[PDB]
């Protein structure tokens, strides 16, 4: 805010589930398609959602929150998971839940 914010040290981050014109997104179900989307069976025929995504809730709305983890792994995975903020027009929020945005992410 007119000082130094260059950068921070961000390793989690959370996608609300409302807009930037502060509606939420829908289905209420997005939250854990993202965590499908990146999941696997683990060898016993159940899903096992990743441990990098978890659903939350925030002032009462759902959200999904985003280990910084996963970059390292698979920065593709992660990549594609910053881009549906941006398509759906989610507020990106940090751990704290500051409303920031996604070059604050992938550039550490």
């Not at 990549?79 to 604050?104: C, K, P, R, V, W």
Request: aromatic share 8%; proline share 5%.
């Amino acid at each position: 805010g007119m000082g130094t914010t260059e950068k921070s040290g961000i390793k989690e981050i959370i996608i609300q589930g409302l807009t930037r014109a502060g509606k939420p997104f829908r289905p209420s179900d997005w939250v854990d398609r993202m965590c499908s989307t990146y999941a696997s069976f683990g060898a016993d025929r159940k899903l096992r959602y990743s441990p990098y995504l978890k659903p939350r809730v925030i002032e009462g709305v759902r959200c999904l929150a985003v280990d910084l983890k996963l970059k390292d792994t698979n920065p593709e995975g992660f990549n594609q998971l910053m881009h549906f903020a941006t398509e759906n027009q989610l507020n990106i929020l940090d751990a704290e839940g500051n409303s920031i945005d996604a070059a604050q992410v992938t550039e550490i």
